[PDB]
Amino acid sequence: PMCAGCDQHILDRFILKALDRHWHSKCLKCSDCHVPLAERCFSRGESVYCKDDFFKRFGTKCAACQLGIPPTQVVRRAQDFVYHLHCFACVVCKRQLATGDEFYLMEDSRLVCKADYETAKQGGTPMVAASPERHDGGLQANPVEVQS
Protein backbone atom coordinates (compact mmCIF):
# COMPACT_ATOMS: atom_id res chain seq x y z
CA PRO A 1 0.00 0.00 0.00
CA MET A 2 1.89 3.11 -1.24
CA CYS A 3 0.52 6.29 0.38
CA ALA A 4 0.12 8.89 -2.27
CA GLY A 5 0.77 11.59 0.27
CA CYS A 6 4.26 10.72 1.41
CA ASP A 7 5.67 7.93 -0.61
CA GLN A 8 6.31 5.79 2.30
CA HIS A 9 4.03 2.74 2.14
CA ILE A 10 1.33 2.28 4.83
CA LEU A 11 1.50 0.07 7.94
CA ASP A 12 -1.08 1.87 10.15
CA ARG A 13 -4.03 0.22 11.92
CA PHE A 14 -6.37 2.29 9.73
CA ILE A 15 -5.98 3.06 6.02
CA LEU A 16 -7.75 5.84 4.10
CA LYS A 17 -9.23 5.35 0.63
CA ALA A 18 -9.63 8.56 -1.44
CA LEU A 19 -9.39 9.49 -5.14
CA ASP A 20 -8.78 5.81 -5.66
CA ARG A 21 -5.58 6.26 -3.69
CA HIS A 22 -4.18 5.00 -0.39
CA TRP A 23 -3.18 7.30 2.46
CA HIS A 24 -1.81 7.46 5.98
CA SER A 25 -4.48 9.59 7.72
CA LYS A 26 -1.72 12.10 8.67
CA CYS A 27 -1.07 12.45 4.87
CA LEU A 28 -4.61 12.91 3.57
CA LYS A 29 -4.55 16.50 4.65
CA CYS A 30 -5.32 19.82 2.97
CA SER A 31 -2.65 20.76 0.42
CA ASP A 32 -2.83 24.38 1.73
CA CYS A 33 -3.55 24.25 5.51
CA HIS A 34 -2.27 20.73 6.18
CA VAL A 35 -5.44 19.87 8.08
CA PRO A 36 -6.46 16.21 8.00
CA LEU A 37 -9.35 15.36 5.65
CA ALA A 38 -12.36 13.28 6.82
CA GLU A 39 -15.54 11.96 5.14
CA ARG A 40 -15.15 13.99 1.92
CA CYS A 41 -12.54 16.10 0.23
CA PHE A 42 -12.23 18.33 -2.81
CA SER A 43 -9.66 18.01 -5.53
CA ARG A 44 -8.44 20.07 -8.46
CA GLY A 45 -6.82 17.32 -10.44
CA GLU A 46 -3.97 15.93 -8.35
CA SER A 47 -4.15 17.87 -5.09
CA VAL A 48 -6.68 17.69 -2.25
CA TYR A 49 -8.18 20.57 -0.27
CA CYS A 50 -10.40 21.13 2.67
CA LYS A 51 -13.56 23.12 1.75
CA ASP A 52 -12.41 26.59 2.98
CA ASP A 53 -9.17 26.46 1.01
CA PHE A 54 -10.84 25.01 -2.11
CA PHE A 55 -13.14 28.04 -2.31
CA LYS A 56 -10.38 30.51 -1.45
CA ARG A 57 -8.30 29.01 -4.24
CA PHE A 58 -10.78 28.07 -6.93
CA GLY A 59 -13.75 30.23 -5.92
CA THR A 60 -14.92 33.57 -7.37
CA LYS A 61 -12.23 36.17 -6.87
CA CYS A 62 -12.72 39.69 -5.56
CA ALA A 63 -12.12 41.92 -8.65
CA ALA A 64 -10.26 44.44 -6.50
CA CYS A 65 -8.04 42.33 -4.21
CA GLN A 66 -8.23 39.04 -6.25
CA LEU A 67 -8.84 36.78 -3.13
CA GLY A 68 -11.33 33.89 -3.28
CA ILE A 69 -14.81 34.60 -1.95
CA PRO A 70 -16.62 31.60 -0.38
CA PRO A 71 -20.38 31.06 -1.06
CA THR A 72 -20.81 32.23 2.62
CA GLN A 73 -19.75 35.93 2.31
CA VAL A 74 -21.96 38.82 1.33
CA VAL A 75 -20.51 40.93 -1.55
CA ARG A 76 -21.18 43.89 -3.82
CA ARG A 77 -21.26 43.53 -7.53
CA ALA A 78 -20.96 45.60 -10.69
CA GLN A 79 -22.04 43.73 -13.82
CA ASP A 80 -20.21 40.43 -13.64
CA PHE A 81 -17.53 41.63 -11.25
CA VAL A 82 -17.88 40.80 -7.57
CA TYR A 83 -16.29 42.79 -4.71
CA HIS A 84 -15.76 42.43 -1.00
CA LEU A 85 -17.76 44.87 1.18
CA HIS A 86 -14.47 46.53 2.16
CA CYS A 87 -13.19 46.51 -1.45
CA PHE A 88 -16.19 48.16 -3.24
CA ALA A 89 -14.56 51.59 -2.82
CA CYS A 90 -13.54 54.37 -5.25
CA VAL A 91 -10.07 53.67 -6.66
CA VAL A 92 -9.30 57.46 -6.74
CA CYS A 93 -10.57 58.81 -3.40
CA LYS A 94 -10.72 55.34 -1.60
CA ARG A 95 -14.22 56.08 -0.17
CA GLN A 96 -16.28 52.94 0.48
CA LEU A 97 -19.31 53.00 -1.73
CA ALA A 98 -22.83 52.54 -0.38
CA THR A 99 -26.26 51.53 -1.70
CA GLY A 100 -27.54 54.25 -4.04
CA ASP A 101 -24.10 55.76 -4.59
CA GLU A 102 -23.53 56.72 -8.21
CA PHE A 103 -20.28 55.35 -9.62
CA TYR A 104 -18.62 54.18 -12.81
CA LEU A 105 -17.46 50.74 -13.65
CA MET A 106 -14.31 51.04 -15.78
CA GLU A 107 -13.30 48.55 -18.47
CA ASP A 108 -10.75 46.99 -16.12
CA SER A 109 -12.91 46.34 -13.04
CA ARG A 110 -11.92 49.70 -11.50
CA LEU A 111 -14.59 51.51 -9.53
CA VAL A 112 -14.73 55.30 -9.70
CA CYS A 113 -17.32 57.42 -7.87
CA LYS A 114 -19.30 59.95 -9.97
CA ALA A 115 -17.38 62.97 -8.53
CA ASP A 116 -14.05 61.51 -9.69
CA TYR A 117 -15.21 60.19 -13.03
CA GLU A 118 -14.07 63.19 -15.23
CA THR A 119 -10.71 62.70 -13.48
CA ALA A 120 -10.50 58.89 -14.19
CA LYS A 121 -11.52 59.00 -17.87
CA GLN A 122 -8.73 61.54 -18.58
CA GLY A 123 -6.37 58.81 -17.23
CA GLY A 124 -16.78 54.08 -18.15
CA THR A 125 -20.34 52.64 -17.53
CA PRO A 126 -22.40 54.66 -14.97
CA MET A 127 -24.24 52.58 -12.38
CA VAL A 128 -25.96 52.99 -9.00
CA ALA A 129 -24.62 50.79 -6.16
CA ALA A 130 -26.87 47.81 -5.50
CA SER A 131 -27.44 46.38 -2.06
CA PRO A 132 -25.12 43.67 -0.97
CA GLU A 133 -25.95 40.02 -1.68
CA ARG A 134 -24.86 36.57 -0.70
CA HIS A 135 -22.22 35.59 -3.23
CA ASP A 136 -23.45 32.99 -5.67
CA GLY A 137 -20.21 31.07 -6.01
CA GLY A 138 -20.20 31.49 -9.75
CA LEU A 139 -23.73 30.87 -10.91
CA GLN A 140 -24.42 31.31 -14.58
CA ALA A 141 -26.37 34.45 -14.61
CA ASN A 142 -28.40 36.37 -17.07
CA PRO A 143 -28.25 40.17 -17.48
CA VAL A 144 -31.36 42.42 -17.32
CA GLU A 145 -30.67 45.45 -19.59
CA VAL A 146 -32.79 48.59 -19.88
CA GLN A 147 -33.80 50.53 -23.07
CA SER A 148 -35.85 53.75 -23.17
Chain contacts with a copy of itself (rule: CB under 8 A): 13-19, 28, 37-43, 48, 51, 71-72, 130, 133-134, 136-137, 139, 141-148
Q: Please tell me whether residue 93 binds Zn ion under the rule CB under 5 A.
A: yes
What does the alpha-carbon distance between residue 21 and residue 48 come to, in Å, rounded to a whole number? 12
Please name the residues in contact with 141: beta carbons below 8 A apart, sequence gap of 6 or more. 80
Q: Please tell me whether residue 24 binds Zn ion under the rule CB under 5 A.
A: yes
What does the alpha-carbon distance between residue 59 and residue 56 come to, in Å, rounded to a whole number? 6
In the bound complex, what is the minimum distance in angstroms from residue 91's beta carbon to a copy of itself? 22
**Partner in contact with 53, chosen from Zn ion, a copy of itself, none, beta carbon below 5 to 8 Å by kind:** Zn ion
- Footprint of Zn ion on 41-70 (CB under 5 A): 50, 53, 62, 64-65
Please name the residues in contact with 26: beta carbons below 8 A apart, sequence gap of 6 or more. 5, 36
**Partner in contact with 84, chosen from Zn ion, a copy of itself, none, beta carbon below 5 to 8 Å by kind:** Zn ion
Q: Please tell me whether residue 113 binds Zn ion under the rule CB under 5 A.
A: yes
Q: Give the residues across from 132 on adjacent strands.
A: none
- Report yes or no: 1 and 14 within 8 Å, Cβ to Cβ: no
